[PDB]
């Protein structure tokens, strides 16, 4: 039997599934460590690797990209977990090697591949403490070209009144996502700052792991793909909505939590986002 991880329920993805919308024909690039395409609970539509020494994007030697992918789009069937957008066209854009790290140029090359291949949504469960002009240019170019770009905010917790949001999440064109638990409390590790946009479940999130496994991971990395998945659900119901409109729909229908420095606009609610008229619940 299939299990629905609590986070998929918490963002109200099942309301879209019951309306008949599951992300069909929406192309989502998971820009990450690869995706294990052999997993029976995933279907990978395509991809490319930007890592010089790991040329197969369908081999995930870390595990992180496969876990993130399963939150976006684990298949709707009688096994494993259910994804947020289980009919999405999932693309493995490998920019991180086995050790979890990549050069800025590899991430930029991955973003450029996504734009050239007409991806509708990019998820980046990754980042670093400094930006670069070339990094900002790539994400701005993706957004100018119509792509919804979502990134994890970082797990740097608090530092007085300073922002601890990572790049590329910290750029205005990118939706930066923090982590809450099942009680809607911010995870203690979740980054904070005026750049924090929305929150999603990021504590004890069950998803797919390489070699036909499953497991619970923690992080803003786990929160980001709930929002990337939600963007795909929204586009599958409203295929003419622009990235601008998808982004506004998510921001404008969150359940508000605490102060925006710590919680941004609050927890996403994809049921409310995918209606025509938007308000917070």
């Amino acid at each position: 039997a299939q299990s629905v991880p609590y986070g998929v329920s918490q963002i109200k993805a099942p309301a879209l599934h019951s309306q008949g919308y599951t992300g069909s024909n929406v192309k989502v690039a998971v820009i990450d460590s690869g995706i294990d395409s052999s997993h029976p609970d995933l279907k990978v539509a395509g991809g490319a690797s930007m890592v010089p020494s790991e040329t197969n994007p369908f081999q995930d030697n870390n595990s992180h990209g496969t876990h993130v992918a399963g939150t976006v789009a684990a298949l709707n069937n009688s096994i494993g977990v259910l994804g947020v957008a289980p009919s999405a066209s999932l693309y493995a854009v490998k920019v991180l090697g086995a050790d979890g790290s990549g050069q800025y140029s590899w991430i930029i090359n991955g973003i450029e591949w996504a734009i050239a291949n007409n991806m509708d949504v990019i998820n980046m469960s990754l980042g670093g403490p400094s930006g670069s002009a070339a990094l900002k240019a790539a994400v701005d170019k993706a957004v100018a070209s119509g792509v919804v770009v979502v990134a994890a905010a970082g797990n740097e917790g608090t530092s007085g009144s300073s922002s601890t949001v990572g790049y590329p999440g910290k750029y205005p064109s990118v939706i930066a996502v923090g982590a809450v638990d099942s009680s809607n409390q911010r995870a203690s590790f979740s980054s904070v700052g005026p750049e924090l946009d929305v929150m999603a479940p990021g504590v004890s999130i069950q998803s797919t792991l390489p070699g036909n496994k499953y497991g619970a991971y923690n992080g803003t990395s786990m929160a980001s793909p709930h929002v990337a998945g939600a963007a795909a659900l929204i586009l599958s119901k409203h295929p003419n909505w622009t990235n601008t409109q998808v982004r506004s729909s998510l921001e404008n229908t969150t359940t508000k939590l605490g102060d925006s420095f710590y919680y941004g606009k609050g927890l996403i609610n994809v049921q409310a986002a995918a209606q025509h008229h938007h308000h917070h619940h």
Partner: protein
């Protein structure tokens, strides 16, 4: 229980490993270049050490 080591910035990667394993003997330590992009999952057992091109610590080590 220590989770951040600001005193290790500017030290050798060797001394940082030694100190961190005294405070957290079961730590999974991974050395990475400063100025790379990394995964944003949270691992309470992990301490990443970000080094400059001389193999000195370039950023405050922390658990995660």
């Amino acid at each position: 229980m220590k989770t951040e080591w600001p005193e290790l910035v500017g030290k050798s990667v060797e001394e940082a490993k030694k100190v961190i394993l005294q405070d957290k003997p079961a730590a999974q330590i991974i050395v990475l270049p400063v100025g790379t992009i990394v995964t944003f999952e949270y691992r309470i057992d992990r301490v990443r050490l970000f080094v400059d091109r001389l193999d000195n610590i370039a950023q405050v080590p922390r658990v995660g």
